[PDB]
Every structure is written in structure tokens, then in C-alpha cells.
Amino acid sequence: KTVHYLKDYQTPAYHILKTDLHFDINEPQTVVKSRLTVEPQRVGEPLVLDGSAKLLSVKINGAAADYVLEGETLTIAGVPSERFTVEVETEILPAENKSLMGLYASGGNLFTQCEPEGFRKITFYIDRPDVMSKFTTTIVADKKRYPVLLSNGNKIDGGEFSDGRHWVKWEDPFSKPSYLFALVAGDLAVTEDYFTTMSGRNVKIEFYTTEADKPKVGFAVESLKNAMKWDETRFGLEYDLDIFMVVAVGDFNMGAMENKGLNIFNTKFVLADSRTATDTDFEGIESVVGHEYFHNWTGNRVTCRDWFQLSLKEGLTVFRDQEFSGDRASRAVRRIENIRLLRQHQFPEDAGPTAHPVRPASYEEMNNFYTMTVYEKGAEVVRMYHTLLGEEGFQKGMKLYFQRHDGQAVTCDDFRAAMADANGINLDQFALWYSQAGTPVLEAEGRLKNNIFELTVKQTVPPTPDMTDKQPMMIPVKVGLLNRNGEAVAFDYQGKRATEAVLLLTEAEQTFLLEGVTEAVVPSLLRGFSAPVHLNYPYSDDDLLLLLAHDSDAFTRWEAAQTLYRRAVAANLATLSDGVELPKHEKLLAAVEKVISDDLLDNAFKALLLGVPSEAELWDGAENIDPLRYHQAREALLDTLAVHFLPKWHELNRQAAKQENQSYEYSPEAAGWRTLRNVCRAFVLRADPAHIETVAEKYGEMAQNMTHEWGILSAVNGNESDTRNRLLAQFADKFSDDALVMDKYFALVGSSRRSDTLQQVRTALQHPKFSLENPNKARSLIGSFSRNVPHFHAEDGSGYRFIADKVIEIDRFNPQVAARLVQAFNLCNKLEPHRKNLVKQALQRIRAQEGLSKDVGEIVGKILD
Ligand SMILES: N[C@@H](CCc1ccccc1)P(=O)(O)O
Numbered sequence: 096k097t098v099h100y101l102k103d104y105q106t107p108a109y110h111i112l113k114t115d116l117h118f119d120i121n122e123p124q125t126v127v128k129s130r131l132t133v134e135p136q137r138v139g140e141p142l143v144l145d146g147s148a149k150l151l152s153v154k155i156n157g158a159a160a161d162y163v164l165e166g167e168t169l170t171i172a173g174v175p176s177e178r179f180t181v182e183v184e185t186e187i188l189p190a191e192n193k194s195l196m197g198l199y200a201s202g203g204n205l206f207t208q209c210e211p212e213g214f215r216k217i218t219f220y221i222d223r224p225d226v227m228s229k230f231t232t233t234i235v236a237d238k239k240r241y242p243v244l245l246s247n248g249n250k251i252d253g254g255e256f257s258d259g260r261h262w263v264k265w266e267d268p269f270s271k272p273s274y275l276f277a278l279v280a281g282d283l284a285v286t287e288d289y290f291t292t293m294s295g296r297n298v299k300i301e302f303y304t305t306e307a308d309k310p311k312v313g314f315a316v317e318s319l320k321n322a323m324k325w326d327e328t329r330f331g332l333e334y335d336l337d338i339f340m341v342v343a344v345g346d347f348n349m350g351a352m353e354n355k356g357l358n359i360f361n362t363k364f365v366l367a368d369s370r371t372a373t374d375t376d377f378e379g380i381e382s383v384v385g386h387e388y389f390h391n392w393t394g395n396r397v398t399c400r401d402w403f404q405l406s407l408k409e410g411l412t413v414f415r416d417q418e419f420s421g422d423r424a425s426r427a428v429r430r431i432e433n434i435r436l437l438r439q440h441q442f443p444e445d446a447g448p449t450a451h452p453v454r455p456a457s458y459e460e461m462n463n464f465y466t467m468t469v470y471e472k473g474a475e476v477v478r479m480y481h482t483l484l485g486e487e488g489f490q491k492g493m494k495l496y497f498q499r500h501d502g503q504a505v506t507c508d509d510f511r512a513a514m515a516d517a518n519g520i521n522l523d524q525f526a527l528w529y530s531q532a533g534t535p536v537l538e539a540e541g542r543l544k545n546n547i548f549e550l551t552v553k554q555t556v557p558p559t560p561d562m563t564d565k566q567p568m569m570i571p572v573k574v575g576l577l578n579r580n581g582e583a584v585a586f587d588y589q590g591k592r593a594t595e596a597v598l599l600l601t602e603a604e605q606t607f608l609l610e611g612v613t614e615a616v617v618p619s620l621l622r623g624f625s626a627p628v629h630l631n632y633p634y635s636d637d638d639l640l641l642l643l644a645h646d647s648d649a650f651t652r653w654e655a656a657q658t659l660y661r662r663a664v665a666a667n668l669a670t671l672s673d674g675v676e677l678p679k680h681e682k683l684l685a686a687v688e689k690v691i692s693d694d695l696l697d698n699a700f701k702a703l704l705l706g707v708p709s710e711a712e713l714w715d716g717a718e719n720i721d722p723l724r725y726h727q728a729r730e731a732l733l734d735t736l737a738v739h740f741l742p743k744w745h746e747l748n749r750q751a752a753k754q755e756n757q758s759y760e761y762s763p764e765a766a767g768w769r770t771l772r773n774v775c776r777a778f779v780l781r782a783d784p785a786h787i788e789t790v791a792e793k794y795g796e797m798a799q800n801m802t803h804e805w806g807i808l809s810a811v812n813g814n815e816s817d818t819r820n821r822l823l824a825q826f827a828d829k830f831s832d833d834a835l836v837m838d839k840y841f842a843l844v845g846s847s848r849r850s851d852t853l854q855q856v857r858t859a860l861q862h863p864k865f866s867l868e869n870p871n872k873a874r875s876l877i878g879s880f881s882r883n884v885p886h887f888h889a890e891d892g893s894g895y896r897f898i899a900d901k902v903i904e905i906d907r908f909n910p911q912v913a914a915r916l917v918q919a920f921n922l923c924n925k926l927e928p929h930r931k932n933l934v935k936q937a938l939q940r941i942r943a944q945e946g947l948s949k950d951v952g953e954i955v956g957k958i959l960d
Pocket residue numbers: 208210211348349350351352353386387390409465
């Protein structure tokens with residue numbers, strides 16, 4: 096079983112200077128011919144090409160090569176000592192490609208996905224990102240069937256043939272790794288716009304969609320134009336071609352893809368209108384359109400040496416996309432959402448069997464490393480450079496990075512060195528953020544003696560499956576102090592008098608002296624979530640209420656609420672387990688009443704303060720978990736809050752509706768009110784499930800956009816009324832023609848806490864609009880069921896069996912989807928014995944499948960072995 100190790104990296108023996116491709120598209124086969132111009136680096140080594148397409152011929156300088164093909168590699172032993180050409184002819188059946196990697200069909204059109212190692216499914220090549228070549232691509236096809244023929248770069252020639260066929264030739268002048276190749280052939284509608292760069296050069300913008308989806312592309316176009324302007328104003332980065340194309344595709348494994356000048360997007364991240372897309376969907380488009388555009392510099396112009404460096408482009412591009420969205424609107428709310436995402440999804444990963452460093456030391460299947468750790472913790476790591484260095488110094492680091500490395504394939508170490516060198520600071524210890532897996536745990540204690548607040552802080556990082564030794568890391572802790580009435584208190588550190596400071600923890604244990612303090616204080620700690628850590632400080636319930644009411648930092652106010660909810664859930668667990676009455680939660684209820692009633696709180700921030708941590712956050716750190724017990728305790732808390740404040744939930748909803756003021760289109764302002772409104776609806780329908788018939792009666796009047804339909808349907812989705820079933824059926828009939836709205840129906844089916852979800856999910860498998868072979872559908876229905884705690888973790892094992900059956904079925908055509916699904920079982924070692932036994936059986940049965948993919952195999956072994 097091949098494992099790839101970062102320690103074994105060696106530069107390539109061969110470079111590829113020029114890559115000329117010819118695609119001859121027919122029914123059913125596409126024949127690909129290449130001409131590669133190959134430059135020896137280590138003369139006399141065998142030429143080894145990666146590839147898995149059907150091989151029809153290979154030549155070296157025009158003569159039939161003597162070669163051997165074994166597995167997915169082709170080797171030619173007798174190669175010239177100087178420049179030579181290699182010609183390879185392959186044949187592909189793209190309508191049989193259900194993996195959606197390489198060249199594949201979708202909606203009668205043809206698309207590619209090459210990142211990370213898809214290009215070798217098209218031709219034989221040196222398919223690694225430190226090999227950068229200049230591509231020119233010729234495409235020939237039936238004109239009526241394939242009128243749009245695209246590939247990267249500039250379109251330099253084209254023509255017609257008498258038999259109905261036409262051709263185009265695309266030249267991309269920038270050297271690139273093979274993972275950034277793209278090709279599209281299809282009958283697609285175009286939407287045209289343009290942007291004029293800071294140097295006065297127009298860039299033609301073209302979005303390609305189906306003819307029916309074209310009216311939903313306008314928000315994405317405007318978001319691209321905003322991202323282009325923003326890279327220029329914030330980073331001083333300008334686009335480098337006079338054309339930028341984006342192509343939407345309904346069958347796609349991930350969100351989008353930054354192929355140079357020809358980005359390919361999942362429909363879900365480009366199409367929206369207010370009738371069919373929620374405000375969250377719009378925000379997603381804005382983030383992801385920016386994200387892919389930001390890759391032009393952070394990924395394309397500067398690339399990755401090897402796949403272990405994935406976070407070099409993804410952490411930094413996520414950071415860029417986060418900063419773009421925060422500059423657009425609602426910076427603090429958006430930051431909290433990001434933190435919440437990290438703690439809900441990335442913390443469990445770092446605590447579990449598949450935990451890995453931001454820059455892994457080894458992998459079996461690289462597709463398994465497109466993770467919350469590489470992306471979201473990666474962005475947190477980039478952000479720490481910003482926190483340490485300031486915006487100006489961070490920009491000096493970026494400028495040096497591009498001066499040094501424009502045109503190169505580089506490492507996380509190079510980025511770190513650029514940050515360090517541009518600012519004249521030593522960041523050697525900072526490398527541990529790349530190499531050390533696990534969430535650091537800070538233990539802190541504070542004392543005000545004399546007029547010094549002495550904050551003592553210890554750090555530790557647990558062993559993870561790859562590594563036991565974890566040394567002290569460089570951790571910035573941003574702090575403030577509140578007095579007895581919650582106003583800010585100034586303090587001295589280090590020779591500066593201010594109301595905030597970044598305390599830099601670099602050792603196992605340190606004491607920080609905040610001097611010149613004249614009042615009794617409670618510290619505010621880890622402001623802005625200044626490092627991706629767990630922090631334990633002994634706070635009283637009154638201290639948490641003070642922080643929530645009065646602290647000036649969003650994160651720490653929201654963390655205080657989160658802590659109160661968590662403590663209440665813990666209290667419920669205790670009573671439920673003793674068979675006694677539920678706690679009163681008198682202080683939490685009083686804090687919540689304050690939030691509800693506070694009219695100076697931003698609407699969307701208010702909604703976050705009223706969100707209860709998820710079950711996985713609640714069982715973080717526990718052993719012998721019974722997921723249903725945590726679910727029960729959380730549900731009891733939500734029911735308490737729903738019922739206790741029912742009339743005030745109705746009132747808040749009404750104030751929010753009045754303020755929304757019939758502005759149903761997307762804007763950050765209107766969205767905030769809708770978000771609050773949807774929190775109220777959830778609570779109302781908890782407390783008074785009968786209110787569903789009153790909703791049903793006025794449904795048309797309430798259904799003024801998808802944010803409202805989604806919010807209502809979400810609110811009632813766990814209701815045992817038949818009316819919940821009728822509303823869902825009517826939703827599926829109304830939007831039957833919109834694939835992205837059908838994804839939403841399937842998600843409601845899969846996520847319901849009603850007792851009869853498993854059978855409704857089984858029926859939905861056979862819905863005319865469901866397709867197991869479509870990643871958006873599979874994820875919506877099955878993926879949602881796998882995260883549906885009461886159903887997935889049912890005591891009878893029915894959930895585990897179902898999900899294991901679908902890993903097995905899906906893995907037969909799409910290992911990437913199946914390997915993402917099988918991670919539903921990651922909690923295995925931490926479950927109570929009865930459920931653990933059943934999960935282990937499910938995983939052994941997956942492992943016993945003949946021909947199980949490497950992708951799913953790798954994850955099952957981490958869990959089981
Ligand atoms: N680089 C892209 C992810 C690539 C990908 C797409 C599909 C399958 C595997 C990897 P993003 O992170 O810009 O979205």
C-alpha cells in the first residue's frame with residue numbers, strides 16, 4: 096500500500112516546457128493527443144509518466160517508443176540527453192466517468208476536474224505541481240452539439256470543417272502545473288460583463304450556464320467584480336489576462352475550482368435569486384467567487400511544490416476570502432460565524448482519529464486532505480501572522496512573497512520566511528503551527544495583587560495519531576479587563592498604557608504582568624479568537640453575565656453566552672441521568688431575557704447569541720459518549736427556552752418583520768433581520784407546534800423569498816404533524832424544476848428529528864429528482880442523515896447500517912463522496928460500548944468489500960486500526 100511522505104520529496108528528473116494538447120470529441124469517445132517538450136534535469140533517468148486513460152500510442156521524437164505500462168505509470172528507459180518530445184494518444188469515454196475527476200460528462204456537456212491528480216486521467220503526464228509548463232489546447236467537436244469550446248487562456252485561432260465540426264485553439268501564456276488545466280465543451284448560454292483593472296486594461300468576464308440557469312448568475316458576476324476591485328485595493332494585486340471565464344456545473348465533487356482563467360463552479364456557488372436562494376446562499380456565492388478569484392495570485396501565480404503544502408494556497412486563500420467578506424459587510428458577525436464553523440467541524444477532526452497537521456507529513460490518498468484542518472485552521476494560522484504583524488506588516492510579507500516566488504512552486508516554509516524576513520522578526524517557533532496537529536489547551540489563572548493583574552497561562556497540546564511530542568507553540572492571546580460595571584480598565588504592558596494588548600505565550604508556562612490597575616477586574620481573554628485554542632479560565636456565572644452584557648469584543652461576548660449554554664446542557668445531563676426534574680437555569684434565563692430585549696444589539700449578532708452549541712461541541716473531550724443523552728439534554732434546553740419565552744419570540748419576530756420592511760432581495764441589512772426572524776420561528780414552533788397550521792394557512796403570504804420558505808420549513812421540520820409532510824411535498828412540487836432547491840428538500844428530509852426519518856429517507860432515494868450519482872444530492876439527503884444525531888446514532892444500529900450500506904454503494908462510482916461520508920463514523924472510539932460495537936461492525940463490513948477504494952480504505956484504517 097503506497098504512502099507518500101513529505102520527507103521523501105525530490106525534485107523531478109524531467110521538466111515539461113511545453114504541453115500541446117489536441118482533443119477530438121466524438122460519440123461516445125474523445126481521443127486526446129499530446130506533444131510534450133521535455134527537458135532533462137537528471138540526464139539518463141527513466142521517464143516516468145502518470146496515467147490511467149486507455150493508451151493508444153506513445154512516441155518519442157516521432158517514433159514509436161519502447162515503453163512499459165504497469166499500473167498507472169508509463170516508463171521509457173531510453174531517453175535523449177537533451178530536449179525531446181513525447182507524443183501520447185489516449186482515449187476517454189467521458190459519459191462513463193461517474194467519479195467526476197478527469198474529463199466527464201454532465202447535463203450533456205463535458206467538463207474537467209484536475210485538482211489534485213485528475214489530469215493523469217486524461218493523458219500521461221508528469222502530474223505533480225512542481226512541474227509547470229506552458230499549455231496550448233486544440234479542441235475539435237460537432238458544432239451543433241458542442242458550440243462552446245473552452246480551455247485556459249487566450250483564444251488564438253479556430254475554424255470550421257464541412258462535415259459539421261468546428262475547432263478552437265487556446266493559448267495560456269503562463270506556465271502552470273497540470274492541476275490547473277481545464278476544458279469545457281458544451282451547449283451553454285453566456286453572460287458577459289467586464290472589469291477595468293487599475294492599469295486601465297479591460298478584462299472581459301464571461302459566465303457560462305445552462306440557458307435556464309442564466310437569469311440566476313447576476314449576483315455572482317457582481318461579486319466577481321467586487322473581488323477584483325478588492326484584491327487591487329487591499330492587496331495591490333491585479334489580474335493578468337484580458338479574459339476571465341466561469342462555468343457552472345451541476346455535477347461536481349466540491350465547491351469550485353480556480354483553473355487559470357477558466358474557473359469551474361458547482362451551481363450552488365454561482366446561482367441565486369431571491370425566490371430560490373437563501374441569504375446564506377448569496378453570502379456563499381460571494382465568498383466562493385472571491386475565493387477562486389483570489390487563487391489567481393495565491394495558488395496560480397505562486398503554486399505548491401507538493402501536495403503536502405496544500406495549506407500554502409488554501410489557508411491563505413480562505414483567509415483572503417474571509418477578509419473580503421468582512422470588508423464587504425458585518426465583519427464581527429462574519430468572524431464569529433467562521434469561529435463557530437471551526438469549532439464545530441475542525442475541532443472534532445483535531446480530536447479524532449483522522450487528525451493531521453496543517454501540513455501533513457504523509458498521505459495515502461491526497462483527496463482525503465481537502466479538510467477543515469488544511470482550510471479553516473490553515474486560515475487561522477495565516478490570520479495569526481496578521482495578528483502578530485499588523486495589516487501593514489502582513490502586506491510587506493505578501494509583497495516579499497510575490498517578489499521572491501512569482502512563477503514558482505513553493506512551501507509553507509517559504510511563506511513563513513517571507514513574513515519573517517519582510518518584518519525583520521524571528522518566526523522559527525511559528526513553524527510548529529504547520530507541523531503539530533491537535534488543538535492547544537491553555538490553562539489560565541489571574542490574580543490582582545497590589546495593582547498588578549498577574550495572568551498565569553500554561554499550554555499543552557495532546558498527542559495525535561501521527562505524533563506524540565508536542566512542544567510549546569507561539570500563541571497570541573489578546574486581552575482586556577472589565578471593572579465591576581463592565582467598563583474597560585486601562586493597564587500597563589509593556590511600557591504602554593492601553594485598554595487591550597496581545598500577550599504572546601511562547602513557553603510551556605508564563606506569567607504576564609498587567610500593571611497600574613486601580614480597580615477590581617475580570618479579564619476578557621482570547622479576543623477576536625486570537626489563536627485557534629481551547630482556553631480554560633475559572634469564570635463564575637456572574638462573570639460570564641458581565642462579559643455578555645458589557646464586553647466590547649464580539650467573540651468574547653458570544654463565548655460567554657456559549658459557556659452559559661454549555662453549563663446548562665451539562666446541568667441537564669446530570670438531572671436527566673439522576674431521574675430528577677430539570678434545573679431552573681435561573682441566571683441563564685435572565686441573561687437570555689436581556690439579549691432578547693436589548694435593542695442596541697445588531698440583529699445578526701443577537702441571533703448568534705441565541706444559538707446553542709451543537710451536540711459535538713457539547714461532547715467534546717468526553718469518553719463513552721451516548722449521543723442520544725447529549726441530544727436529549729440539548730433538546731430540553733431548547734424546549735425550555737422555546738416555552739419560557741414564547742410570547743417574546745413572537746414579539747421579536749414581529750419587530751424583525753417590521754424592520755425588514757418588505758425588502759426581500761438580498762442585502763446584508765435585510766438578511767440580518769431575516770436571520771433573527773428565523774431564530775424566532777424555530778423557537779415558536781418548538782413551543783407551539785400547532786402554530787404550523789396557522790403558518791400553513793398564510794404560507795403564500797409568508798413565502799416572500801427562499802430565506803423565509805427555508806426558515807419556516809426548517810422550523811417545522813421536526814414537527815410530528817402531517818402538515819409538515821404536506822408542506823415539504825408542496826415545496827418539492829413548487830420547485831421541482833430547480834435542482835438547487837431540490838437539494839434543500841432532500842436536506843430537510845435527511846435532517847428531520849421526527850421519528851420516521853429513516854423510512855422517509857429511504858423513500859427519498861427513489862424520488863424522481865434524486866440521483867445518488869450527483870454529489871449535491873447525495874450530500875443533501877445521505878450526508879444530512881449521517882449528521883442527524885438521533886437517527887444516525889439510533890441504538891438499534893439502523894443508522895450505522897444505512898450509512899455503511901451507502902458508503903459501499905457510492906464508493907463503487909465516487910470514492911471522494913464515499914470517503915467524506917464514512918467520516919460520519921469518526922466518533923467510534925469515543926462511543927459507549929453498545930454503539931461502538933455496532934460502528935466497528937459497520938466499518939469492518941466496509942473494509943471487507945472487494946475493490947474498496949484507497950480513499951475510503953485510508954479513512955477506515957485510521958478509525959479501526
Ligand atoms: N482548490 C479548490 C478545491 C479543489 C478541488 C475541487 C474538487 C475536487 C478536489 C479538489 P477550492 O478550494 O478553491 O475550492
